[PDB]
Coordinates of C-alpha atoms and ligand atoms in Angstrom, one line a residue:
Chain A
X1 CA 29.5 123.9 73.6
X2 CA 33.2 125.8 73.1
X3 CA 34.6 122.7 74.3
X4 CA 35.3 119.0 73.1
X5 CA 36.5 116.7 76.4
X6 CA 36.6 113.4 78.3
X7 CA 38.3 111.7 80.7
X8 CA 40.1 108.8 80.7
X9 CA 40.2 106.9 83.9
X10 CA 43.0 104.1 85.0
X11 CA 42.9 100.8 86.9
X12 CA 45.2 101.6 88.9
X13 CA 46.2 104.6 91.5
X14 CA 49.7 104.6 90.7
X15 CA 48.1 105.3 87.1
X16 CA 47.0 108.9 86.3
X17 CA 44.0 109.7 84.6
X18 CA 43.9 111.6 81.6
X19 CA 42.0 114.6 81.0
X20 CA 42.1 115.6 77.3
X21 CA 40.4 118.8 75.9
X22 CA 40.5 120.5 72.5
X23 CA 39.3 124.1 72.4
X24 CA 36.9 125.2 69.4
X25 CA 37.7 127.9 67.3
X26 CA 35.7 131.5 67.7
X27 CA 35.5 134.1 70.9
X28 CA 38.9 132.5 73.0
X29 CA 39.9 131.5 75.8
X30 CA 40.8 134.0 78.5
X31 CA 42.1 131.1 81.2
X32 CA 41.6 127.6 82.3
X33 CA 42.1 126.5 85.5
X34 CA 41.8 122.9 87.5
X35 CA 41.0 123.2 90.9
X36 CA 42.7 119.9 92.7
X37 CA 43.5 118.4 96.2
X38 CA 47.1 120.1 95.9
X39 CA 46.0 122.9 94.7
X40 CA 44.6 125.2 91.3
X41 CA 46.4 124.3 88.4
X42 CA 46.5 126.3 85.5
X43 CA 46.4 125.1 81.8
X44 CA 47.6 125.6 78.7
X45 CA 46.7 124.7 75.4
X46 CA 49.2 124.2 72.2
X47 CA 47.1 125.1 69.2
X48 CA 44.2 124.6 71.2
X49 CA 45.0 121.2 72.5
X50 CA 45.9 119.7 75.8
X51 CA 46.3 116.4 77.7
X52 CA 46.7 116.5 81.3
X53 CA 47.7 114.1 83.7
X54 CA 45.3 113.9 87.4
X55 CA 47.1 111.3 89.8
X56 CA 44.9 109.5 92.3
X57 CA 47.9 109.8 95.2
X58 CA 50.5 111.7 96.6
X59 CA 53.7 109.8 95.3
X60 CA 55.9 111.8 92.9
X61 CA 55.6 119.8 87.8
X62 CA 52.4 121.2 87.3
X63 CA 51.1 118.1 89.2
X64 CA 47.5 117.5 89.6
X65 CA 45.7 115.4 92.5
X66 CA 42.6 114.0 92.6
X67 CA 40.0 115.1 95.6
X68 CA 39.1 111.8 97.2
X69 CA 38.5 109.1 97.6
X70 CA 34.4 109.6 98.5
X71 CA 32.0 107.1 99.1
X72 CA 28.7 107.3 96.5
X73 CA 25.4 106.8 98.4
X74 CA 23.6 103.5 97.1
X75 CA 26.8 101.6 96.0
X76 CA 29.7 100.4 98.4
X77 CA 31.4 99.1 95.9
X78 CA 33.3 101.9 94.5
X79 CA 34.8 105.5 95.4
X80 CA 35.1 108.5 93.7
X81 CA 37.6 110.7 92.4
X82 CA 37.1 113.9 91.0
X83 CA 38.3 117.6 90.2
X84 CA 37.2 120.5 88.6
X85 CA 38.0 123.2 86.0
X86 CA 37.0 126.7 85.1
X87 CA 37.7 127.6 81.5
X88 CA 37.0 131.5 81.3
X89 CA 36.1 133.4 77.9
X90 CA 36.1 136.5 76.3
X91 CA 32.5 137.3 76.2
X92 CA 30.2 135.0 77.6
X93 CA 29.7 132.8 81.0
X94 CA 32.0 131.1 82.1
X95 CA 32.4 126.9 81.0
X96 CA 32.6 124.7 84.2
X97 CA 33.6 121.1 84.1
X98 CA 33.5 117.9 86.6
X99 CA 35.7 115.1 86.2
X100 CA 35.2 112.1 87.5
X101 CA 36.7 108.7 88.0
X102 CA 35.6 105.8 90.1
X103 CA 37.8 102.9 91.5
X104 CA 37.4 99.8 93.2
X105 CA 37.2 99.2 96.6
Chain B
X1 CA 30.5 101.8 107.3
X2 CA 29.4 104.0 110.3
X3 CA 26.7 106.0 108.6
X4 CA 23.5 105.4 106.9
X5 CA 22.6 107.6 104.0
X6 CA 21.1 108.5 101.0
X7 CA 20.3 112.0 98.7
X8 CA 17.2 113.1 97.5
X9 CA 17.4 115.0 94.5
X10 CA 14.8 117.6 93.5
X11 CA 13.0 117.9 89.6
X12 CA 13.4 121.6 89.7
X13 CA 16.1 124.4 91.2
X14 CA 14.1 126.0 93.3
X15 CA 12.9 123.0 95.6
X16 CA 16.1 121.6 97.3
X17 CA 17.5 118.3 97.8
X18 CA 17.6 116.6 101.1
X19 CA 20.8 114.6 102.6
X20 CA 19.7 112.9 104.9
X21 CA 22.3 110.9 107.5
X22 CA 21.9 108.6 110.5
X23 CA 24.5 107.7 112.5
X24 CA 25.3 103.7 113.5
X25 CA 26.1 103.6 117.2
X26 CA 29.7 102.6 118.8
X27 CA 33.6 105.0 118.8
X28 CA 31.7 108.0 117.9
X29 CA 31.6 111.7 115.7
X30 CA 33.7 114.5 116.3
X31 CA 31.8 116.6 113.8
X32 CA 30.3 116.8 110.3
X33 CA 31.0 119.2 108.0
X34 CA 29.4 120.1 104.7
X35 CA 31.4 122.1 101.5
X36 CA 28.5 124.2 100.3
X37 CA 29.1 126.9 97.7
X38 CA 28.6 129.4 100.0
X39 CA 31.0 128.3 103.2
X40 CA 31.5 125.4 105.5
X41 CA 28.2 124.1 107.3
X42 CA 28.5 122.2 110.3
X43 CA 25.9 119.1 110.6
X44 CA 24.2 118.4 114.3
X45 CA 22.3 115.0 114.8
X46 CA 19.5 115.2 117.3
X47 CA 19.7 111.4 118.4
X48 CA 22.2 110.4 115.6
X49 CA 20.1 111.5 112.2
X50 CA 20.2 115.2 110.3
X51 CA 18.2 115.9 107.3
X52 CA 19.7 118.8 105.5
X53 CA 18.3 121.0 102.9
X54 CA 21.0 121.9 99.8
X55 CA 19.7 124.3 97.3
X56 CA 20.6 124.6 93.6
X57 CA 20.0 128.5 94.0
X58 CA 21.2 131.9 95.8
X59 CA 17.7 132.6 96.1
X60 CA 16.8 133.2 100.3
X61 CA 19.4 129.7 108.4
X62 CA 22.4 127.3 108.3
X63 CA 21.7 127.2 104.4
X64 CA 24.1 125.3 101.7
X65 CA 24.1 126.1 98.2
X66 CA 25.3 123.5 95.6
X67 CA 28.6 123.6 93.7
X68 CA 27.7 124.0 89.9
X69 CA 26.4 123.8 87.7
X70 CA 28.5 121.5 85.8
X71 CA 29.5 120.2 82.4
X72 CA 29.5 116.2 82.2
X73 CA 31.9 114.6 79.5
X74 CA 29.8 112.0 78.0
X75 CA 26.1 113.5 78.0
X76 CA 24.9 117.2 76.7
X77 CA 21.4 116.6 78.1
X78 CA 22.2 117.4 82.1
X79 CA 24.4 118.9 84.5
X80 CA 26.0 118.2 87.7
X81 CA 25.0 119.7 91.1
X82 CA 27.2 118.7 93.9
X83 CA 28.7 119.1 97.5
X84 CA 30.9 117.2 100.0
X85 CA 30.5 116.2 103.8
X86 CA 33.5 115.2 105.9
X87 CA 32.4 113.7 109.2
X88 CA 35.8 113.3 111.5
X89 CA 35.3 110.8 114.5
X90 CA 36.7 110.1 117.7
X91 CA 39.1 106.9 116.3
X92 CA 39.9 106.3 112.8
X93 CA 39.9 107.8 109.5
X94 CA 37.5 110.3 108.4
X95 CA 34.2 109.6 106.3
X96 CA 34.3 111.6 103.2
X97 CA 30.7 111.8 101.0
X98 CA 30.3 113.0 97.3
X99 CA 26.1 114.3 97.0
X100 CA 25.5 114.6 93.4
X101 CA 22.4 115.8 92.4
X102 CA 21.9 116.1 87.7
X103 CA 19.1 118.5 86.8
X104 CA 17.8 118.5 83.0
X105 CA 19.6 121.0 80.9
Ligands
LIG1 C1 27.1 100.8 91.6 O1 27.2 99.5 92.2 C2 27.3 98.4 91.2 C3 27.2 97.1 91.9 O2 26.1 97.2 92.9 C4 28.6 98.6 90.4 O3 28.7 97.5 89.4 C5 28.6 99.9 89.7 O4 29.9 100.1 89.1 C6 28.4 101.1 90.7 N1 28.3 102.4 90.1 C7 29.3 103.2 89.8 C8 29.0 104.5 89.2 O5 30.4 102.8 90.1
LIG2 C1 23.4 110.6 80.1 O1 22.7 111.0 78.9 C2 21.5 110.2 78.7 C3 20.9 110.6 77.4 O2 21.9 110.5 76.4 C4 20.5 110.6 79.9 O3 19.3 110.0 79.7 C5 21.1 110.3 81.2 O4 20.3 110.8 82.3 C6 22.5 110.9 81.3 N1 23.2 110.5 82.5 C7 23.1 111.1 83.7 C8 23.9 110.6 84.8 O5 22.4 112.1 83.8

């Protein structure tokens, strides 16, 4: 894969996840775009490198919000969070991405 | 919680998975609503339960596609099929539901 990711989720609402991606060299990167509650966000990447912030709630530039909470079907002990992005190339199929975080409740 | 559920995934893309939902009596629904791929589905339960059909594929009556495929940061060896049903009832907040289905890839 083009692509080298993960996501690092917080304890805490009030504490954004991370999403952190570093692009691999050729073929580029046409546009990437996250597709949150608020709204698509675009991104950018510096030499190929980006961190971005994805805030569970509303409170608070480029902003990015989580779609959720959603209950999971056999546990009731957690919710989900989650958003997506759409990394278009050159040549070749588009790379699509789910990100997910789970918190208490 | 107010409903009963579970998802069944399928082994292969062109046999769907099945959501399948049954209401707990009284306060009751307003409606149910599915985000498929392809549109907004509405969900009717005859006597309070719905099984519904959610295809991986294009290929074909009230239907629902899957969002995806898609990209999962820790593991190379699936992907992520997915939708999301809001059911709004008559008093209190809405019941939002994450169906994930992973197929081998
Ligand atoms: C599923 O439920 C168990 C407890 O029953 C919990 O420890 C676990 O974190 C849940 N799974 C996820 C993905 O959160
Ligand atoms: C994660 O990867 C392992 C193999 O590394 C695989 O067996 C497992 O099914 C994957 N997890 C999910 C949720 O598909």
């Amino acid at each position: 894969t083009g692509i080298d990711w993960d996501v690092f989720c917080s304890q805490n609402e009030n504490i954004p996840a991370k999403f952190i991606s570093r692009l691999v060299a050729p073929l580029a990167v046409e546009k990437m775009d996250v597709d949150c509650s608020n709204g698509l966000v675009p991104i950018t990447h510096e030499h190929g490198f980006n961190m971005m912030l994805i805030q569970y709630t509303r409170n608070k530039p480029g902003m990015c919000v989580f779609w959720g909470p959603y209950s999971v079907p056999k546990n009731d002990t957690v919710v989900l969070y989650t958003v997506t992005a759409r990394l278009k190339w050159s040549e070749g199929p588009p790379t699509d991405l789910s990100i997910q975080c789970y918190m208490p409740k």
